[PDB]
């Protein structure tokens, strides 16, 4: 267990560590967008996801953007055992992304893979939007996706991706250059994970 800022700042409370982590990474997410850096990276690849994860969590989480060395025990959900991860990430890279069916299937596959130690959800929600922006000229208006519905559809996706597919298509917007949709979407993505201390636009 190693979070680069826990021993740097006197952090004794998990709530305080979670507070610093959200603040620092939200500032990184803001810069990723405004610098235009978000639009100069490989779309729908592990290389692309790795870039986002490292950009958000460098200096916060150890091995940011790097593939994990052990298995994930987050709930009863079956993430890919680490022995399958090299093969899994190569398959996802080669998966087609022509339409919503193909894009959702790809996203479900990346959610199962969960290649990093932690922050898989937040980095893959940004990654997804970039596939939608490039291939459909759409993004998700995350304000149209309720938290409880989102998690339920995600738990179900290894069996059937129909529920998550609906949530995304119904939330799709053509306002791909709308800064507020991106910023609000960052706060919602963090809310799905229990981080509500800050509003990235106030950073």
CSV table of C-alpha atoms in Angstrom, one decimal:
chain,number,residue,atom,x,y,z
A,1,UNK,CA,0.0,0.0,0.0
A,2,UNK,CA,1.7,3.2,-1.3
A,3,UNK,CA,0.1,6.6,-2.2
A,4,UNK,CA,3.0,9.1,-2.9
A,5,UNK,CA,1.3,11.9,-0.9
A,6,UNK,CA,0.4,10.0,2.3
A,7,UNK,CA,4.0,10.2,3.7
A,8,UNK,CA,4.8,13.6,2.1
A,9,UNK,CA,2.0,15.5,4.0
A,10,UNK,CA,1.3,14.2,7.4
A,11,UNK,CA,-1.8,12.4,6.2
A,12,UNK,CA,-3.2,10.1,8.9
A,13,UNK,CA,-6.9,10.1,7.8
A,14,UNK,CA,-8.0,8.2,4.7
A,15,UNK,CA,-10.7,11.0,4.2
A,16,UNK,CA,-7.9,13.6,4.1
A,17,UNK,CA,-5.8,11.5,1.6
A,18,UNK,CA,-8.9,11.1,-0.6
A,19,UNK,CA,-9.4,14.9,-0.3
A,20,UNK,CA,-5.8,15.8,-1.5
A,21,UNK,CA,-6.0,13.1,-4.3
A,22,UNK,CA,-9.3,14.5,-5.7
A,23,UNK,CA,-8.0,18.1,-5.7
A,24,UNK,CA,-4.6,17.3,-7.3
A,25,UNK,CA,-6.0,14.9,-10.0
A,26,UNK,CA,-9.0,17.3,-10.8
A,27,UNK,CA,-6.4,20.1,-11.4
A,28,UNK,CA,-4.6,17.7,-13.8
A,29,UNK,CA,-7.9,16.8,-15.6
A,30,UNK,CA,-8.6,20.5,-16.1
A,31,UNK,CA,-5.2,21.1,-17.7
A,32,UNK,CA,-5.5,17.9,-19.8
A,33,UNK,CA,-8.6,19.5,-21.4
A,34,UNK,CA,-7.6,23.3,-21.6
A,35,UNK,CA,-4.0,22.6,-22.9
A,36,UNK,CA,-5.6,20.5,-25.8
A,37,UNK,CA,-3.3,17.6,-24.7
A,38,UNK,CA,-6.5,15.4,-24.4
A,39,UNK,CA,-7.0,15.7,-28.3
A,40,UNK,CA,-3.3,14.9,-29.2
A,41,UNK,CA,-3.3,11.3,-27.8
A,42,UNK,CA,-4.0,7.9,-29.4
A,43,UNK,CA,-7.7,7.1,-29.3
A,44,UNK,CA,-9.1,3.7,-28.1
A,45,UNK,CA,-5.7,2.1,-27.2
A,46,UNK,CA,-4.0,1.1,-24.0
A,47,UNK,CA,-1.2,3.7,-24.9
A,48,UNK,CA,-4.0,6.3,-24.8
A,49,UNK,CA,-5.6,5.1,-21.5
A,50,UNK,CA,-2.1,4.9,-19.9
A,51,UNK,CA,-1.4,8.5,-21.0
A,52,UNK,CA,-4.7,9.8,-19.3
A,53,UNK,CA,-4.1,7.7,-16.1
A,54,UNK,CA,-0.5,9.0,-15.8
A,55,UNK,CA,-1.6,12.6,-16.6
A,56,UNK,CA,-4.3,12.5,-13.8
A,57,UNK,CA,-2.4,10.5,-11.2
A,58,UNK,CA,1.4,11.1,-11.7
A,59,UNK,CA,2.7,12.2,-8.3
A,60,UNK,CA,-0.3,10.8,-6.6
A,61,UNK,CA,-0.4,7.1,-7.2
A,62,UNK,CA,2.7,5.0,-7.6
A,63,UNK,CA,3.1,3.5,-11.1
A,64,UNK,CA,0.5,5.9,-12.7
A,65,UNK,CA,-0.2,4.8,-16.3
A,66,UNK,CA,1.6,1.5,-15.6
A,67,UNK,CA,0.0,-2.0,-15.8
A,68,UNK,CA,-0.7,-3.6,-12.3
A,69,UNK,CA,1.3,-6.6,-11.0
A,70,UNK,CA,-1.4,-8.3,-9.0
A,71,UNK,CA,-5.2,-9.1,-9.0
A,72,UNK,CA,-8.1,-6.7,-8.1
A,73,UNK,CA,-10.6,-7.7,-5.3
A,74,UNK,CA,-13.2,-4.8,-5.8
A,75,UNK,CA,-16.5,-6.4,-4.9
A,76,UNK,CA,-17.6,-9.7,-6.3
A,77,UNK,CA,-17.1,-8.4,-9.9
A,78,UNK,CA,-14.5,-10.4,-11.9
A,79,UNK,CA,-11.8,-8.1,-13.2
A,80,UNK,CA,-9.2,-9.9,-15.5
A,81,UNK,CA,-6.6,-11.8,-13.4
A,82,UNK,CA,-3.2,-10.0,-14.0
A,83,UNK,CA,-1.9,-13.1,-15.9
A,84,UNK,CA,-4.4,-12.4,-18.7
A,85,UNK,CA,-3.7,-8.6,-18.8
A,86,UNK,CA,-1.0,-8.6,-21.5
A,87,UNK,CA,-3.2,-10.6,-23.9
A,88,UNK,CA,-6.4,-8.7,-22.9
A,89,UNK,CA,-4.9,-5.2,-23.6
A,90,UNK,CA,-3.6,-6.4,-27.0
A,91,UNK,CA,-7.1,-7.7,-27.9
A,92,UNK,CA,-8.8,-4.4,-26.9
A,93,UNK,CA,-6.2,-2.4,-29.0
A,94,UNK,CA,-7.3,-4.4,-32.1
A,95,UNK,CA,-11.0,-4.1,-31.4
A,96,UNK,CA,-13.0,-2.0,-33.9
A,97,UNK,CA,-14.6,1.2,-32.9
A,98,UNK,CA,-16.8,2.1,-35.9
A,99,UNK,CA,-20.2,2.4,-34.1
A,100,UNK,CA,-21.9,2.5,-30.7
A,101,UNK,CA,-22.2,-1.3,-30.5
A,102,UNK,CA,-18.4,-1.7,-31.2
A,103,UNK,CA,-17.5,1.3,-28.9
A,104,UNK,CA,-19.6,0.0,-25.9
A,105,UNK,CA,-18.3,-3.6,-26.3
A,106,UNK,CA,-14.7,-2.1,-26.3
A,107,UNK,CA,-15.5,-0.1,-23.1
A,108,UNK,CA,-17.0,-3.1,-21.4
A,109,UNK,CA,-13.8,-5.0,-22.3
A,110,UNK,CA,-11.6,-2.2,-20.8
A,111,UNK,CA,-13.8,-2.1,-17.6
A,112,UNK,CA,-13.2,-5.9,-17.2
A,113,UNK,CA,-9.5,-5.5,-17.9
A,114,UNK,CA,-9.0,-2.7,-15.3
A,115,UNK,CA,-5.2,-2.5,-16.1
A,116,UNK,CA,-4.2,-0.2,-13.3
A,117,UNK,CA,-3.9,-0.6,-9.5
A,118,UNK,CA,-6.4,1.9,-8.9
A,119,UNK,CA,-8.3,4.8,-10.9
A,120,UNK,CA,-9.6,2.5,-13.7
A,121,UNK,CA,-13.1,4.0,-13.7
A,122,UNK,CA,-12.2,7.7,-13.9
A,123,UNK,CA,-9.5,7.2,-16.6
A,124,UNK,CA,-11.7,4.9,-18.7
A,125,UNK,CA,-14.6,7.4,-18.6
A,126,UNK,CA,-12.4,10.0,-20.2
A,127,UNK,CA,-10.9,7.4,-22.7
A,128,UNK,CA,-14.5,6.4,-23.7
A,129,UNK,CA,-15.6,10.0,-24.4
A,130,UNK,CA,-12.5,10.4,-26.7
A,131,UNK,CA,-13.6,7.3,-28.7
A,132,UNK,CA,-17.2,8.8,-29.1
A,133,UNK,CA,-15.7,12.2,-30.0
A,134,UNK,CA,-13.5,10.8,-32.7
A,135,UNK,CA,-15.8,8.1,-34.2
A,136,UNK,CA,-19.3,9.5,-33.7
A,137,UNK,CA,-18.7,13.2,-33.1
A,138,UNK,CA,-20.5,12.7,-29.7
A,139,UNK,CA,-19.7,12.8,-26.0
A,140,UNK,CA,-21.6,11.7,-23.0
A,141,UNK,CA,-23.6,14.3,-21.1
A,142,UNK,CA,-22.9,12.5,-17.8
A,143,UNK,CA,-25.6,14.6,-16.2
A,144,UNK,CA,-28.1,12.3,-18.1
A,145,UNK,CA,-26.6,9.1,-16.4
A,146,UNK,CA,-27.7,8.5,-12.8
A,147,UNK,CA,-25.0,6.9,-10.5
A,148,UNK,CA,-27.1,3.9,-9.3
A,149,UNK,CA,-28.2,3.1,-13.0
A,150,UNK,CA,-24.5,3.5,-14.1
A,151,UNK,CA,-23.1,1.0,-11.5
A,152,UNK,CA,-25.9,-1.5,-12.1
A,153,UNK,CA,-25.4,-1.4,-15.9
A,154,UNK,CA,-21.6,-1.9,-15.3
A,155,UNK,CA,-22.1,-5.0,-13.0
A,156,UNK,CA,-24.3,-6.5,-15.8
A,157,UNK,CA,-22.1,-5.6,-18.8
A,158,UNK,CA,-20.0,-8.9,-18.7
A,159,UNK,CA,-23.3,-10.8,-19.2
A,160,UNK,CA,-25.1,-8.3,-21.4
A,161,UNK,CA,-24.0,-4.7,-22.4
A,162,UNK,CA,-27.5,-3.7,-23.4
A,163,UNK,CA,-28.2,-1.7,-20.2
A,164,UNK,CA,-25.0,0.3,-20.3
A,165,UNK,CA,-25.5,0.8,-24.1
A,166,UNK,CA,-28.9,2.4,-23.5
A,167,UNK,CA,-27.5,4.8,-20.8
A,168,UNK,CA,-24.7,6.0,-23.1
A,169,UNK,CA,-26.8,6.4,-26.4
A,170,UNK,CA,-29.6,8.3,-24.4
A,171,UNK,CA,-26.9,10.5,-22.9
A,172,UNK,CA,-25.0,11.3,-26.2
A,173,UNK,CA,-24.7,14.9,-27.3
A,174,UNK,CA,-23.3,16.7,-30.4
A,175,UNK,CA,-21.8,19.6,-28.3
A,176,UNK,CA,-18.3,18.1,-28.5
A,177,UNK,CA,-16.6,21.6,-27.9
A,178,UNK,CA,-18.7,22.5,-24.8
A,179,UNK,CA,-16.2,23.0,-21.8
A,180,UNK,CA,-19.0,22.8,-19.2
A,181,UNK,CA,-20.1,19.3,-20.4
A,182,UNK,CA,-16.5,18.0,-20.0
A,183,UNK,CA,-16.0,19.8,-16.5
A,184,UNK,CA,-19.4,18.7,-15.1
A,185,UNK,CA,-18.6,15.2,-16.4
A,186,UNK,CA,-15.4,15.1,-14.4
A,187,UNK,CA,-17.3,15.9,-11.2
A,188,UNK,CA,-19.9,13.2,-12.0
A,189,UNK,CA,-17.2,10.6,-12.9
A,190,UNK,CA,-15.6,11.3,-9.4
A,191,UNK,CA,-19.1,11.2,-7.8
A,192,UNK,CA,-19.6,7.7,-9.2
A,193,UNK,CA,-16.6,6.9,-7.1
A,194,UNK,CA,-17.4,8.8,-3.9
A,195,UNK,CA,-15.3,11.9,-4.4
A,196,UNK,CA,-17.5,15.0,-3.9
A,197,UNK,CA,-15.2,17.5,-2.0
A,198,UNK,CA,-14.4,19.7,-5.0
A,199,UNK,CA,-15.9,21.1,-8.2
A,200,UNK,CA,-13.2,21.0,-10.8
A,201,UNK,CA,-14.2,24.4,-12.2
A,202,UNK,CA,-13.5,26.0,-8.9
A,203,UNK,CA,-9.9,24.6,-9.1
